[PDB]
Symmetry: C3
Subunit: 258 residues, 3 copies
Amino acid sequence: MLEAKFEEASLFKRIIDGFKKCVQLVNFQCKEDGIIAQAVDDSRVLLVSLEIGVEAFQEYRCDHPVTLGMDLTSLSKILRCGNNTDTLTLIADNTPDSIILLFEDTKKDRIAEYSLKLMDIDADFLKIEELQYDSTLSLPSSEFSKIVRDLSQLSDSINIMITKETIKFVADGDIGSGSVIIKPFVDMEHPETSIKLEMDQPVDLTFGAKYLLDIIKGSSLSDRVGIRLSSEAPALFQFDLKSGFLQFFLAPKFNDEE
Amino acid sequence: MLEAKFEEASLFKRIIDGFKKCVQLVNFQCKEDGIIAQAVDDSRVLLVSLEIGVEAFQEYRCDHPVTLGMDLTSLSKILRCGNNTDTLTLIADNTPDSIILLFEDTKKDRIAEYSLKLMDIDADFLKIEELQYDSTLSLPSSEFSKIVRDLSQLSDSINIMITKETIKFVADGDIGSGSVIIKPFVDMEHPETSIKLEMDQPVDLTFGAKYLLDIIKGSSLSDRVGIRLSSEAPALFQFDLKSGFLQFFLAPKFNDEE
Amino acid sequence: MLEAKFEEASLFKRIIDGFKKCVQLVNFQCKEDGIIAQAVDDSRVLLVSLEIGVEAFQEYRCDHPVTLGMDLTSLSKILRCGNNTDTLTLIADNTPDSIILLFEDTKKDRIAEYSLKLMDIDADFLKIEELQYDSTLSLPSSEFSKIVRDLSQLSDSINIMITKETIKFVADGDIGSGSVIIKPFVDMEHPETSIKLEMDQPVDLTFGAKYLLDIIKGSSLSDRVGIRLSSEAPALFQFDLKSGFLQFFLAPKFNDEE
């Protein structure tokens, strides 16, 4: 058996929106200590990796490990079916015929029960996070989202450049160009808004804006976004959940296509 | 002559939205005691039947009966032309060249007058309400609307099932399934929200979701919705107006297409 | 050099929306005393003419005259890139390679700099305002906008008719007709809302609704709209800026196409 009760369905809804772009079908490995899920896009340049621990649920129980393969368009369709604030419960049995999603509101009446037919997916799981990235920064998710959205209208390629205490986002395109330059600082009235940066090596990488636009919709899960960039590996964009994370690994455009 | 002054145009606007889906042209029989109107969809599985009495107007006068045949797309276009709160007045003469819609706001200046060319429709009027239905229920229009909207994304056929004190809405589809189960109760703090049910015979009927989605947009006219279901007749969905009603008769899917 | 600092980017954004409809590329002549710009639509029936004086800026400096030819779709794309309240600064040099747009918010950090490649446009500048128009009226921009939007759904041609103290807007079309009749008055509690009219000659002109819909989006720049109409010239619709204007000259439909 498996019973995972979210305190508010909105968290699961936004987690799956993190995947609803950018990728199609997903395996959800539920183990005794929580849920992991991974998904690669078709061009195989962006991996989405979710980890929800037990404390991020209001209740959680998994007797044996169980893998739930799900169509994200169909699961999203099912996930529009409550309020954001209803307690959504995932329920499955030993070898799962299908997953069962059980909503419940503050008015304990009229409980709604959906069921998603589970598909079969072959689980090629990737561990591609490095130990050392060339630079690490963190900034408010809102601010990263606006930078990406704005620059995405000038060209289809956004270029992130890190020098000593200087983070430069640039898009040069046919019509024109744009450049947002941010610098590290500590806001004392609100550590909400600070911009942290550790630079071990300057970086100059360029990413497709399609994918950065995909990545920034995790802003609805975390106040802040962590960006680990490296010339030797895909870049990592991390949104921290209440004891968990949603991660986007994105490969930069190559040298000759910059 | 005919002068029918709505206190607020929004009521007429929402009544015609009740028809703007699901059907195209409509006859409006205006008699000394108010307005009736009827309209069948093309597949001839859903009838929309409106009755507005005199008291639902702020003023009403009809010397002789008169039938106003109207294109609902065109009348809707005309009906976007004020505020929701302006006093809309229908005006016609003995044998009507066309209908005249006269708006007026709280600032008695700049009055706006539209005219809709009347068409010719042959009035095949249907009296298909039964005396006894197998079961009758009533529930808040908001709640019925959310049930229908949610379940409509899983399959194109919603199945209503009434057993002793148990009302079950179910959609099973290709991707998955959903089931909302409600039970009768009396809310004392708010009779707004109660769920009434009289069951003389259990029912198990299945309706096309296209049409239930059409039906639920009468939620903007009434706090509550009344559903009379029967295996021997089309189901009746009723929204009560201030001394009147908007009714949807919907034929269930047949036995072999369930 | 040229440095023109708007106190709020929203003004420039709305000015360019005034052009984003109805016309494609535009020359902006910046001289020592401010900015002028002109643009004709393809059918050559509507001219848009902007004049921003120095006081409409929070800061302004232009050493020598300079013409900035801009793609309005591309400049609009760039103009979605801040907040409405950031101080947008236009910057160019003696002979301009391209225009530079520099945003700045209340939080003086992270300043964003865009650049629009300038095109080459041949400046056929028109001075088509008359001395005497047949009639002049002024009314709230909101009210003119609603009249146009409403009447635009009945036909594609709106007909403005001015008699002694009577301003009549009419659209007769295939489906039906509509007519808004306004009359001059002075509101004392709010000169905001008054309707002024000087009639030297009655007018009966008819305008394509495509273009009136284009014209009314200047409502976001001025509380009021001034309409000079004449049978001997294109009609002039004027929105007054804080020491400036946005003007729409629109040729009426001819006599035989009324």
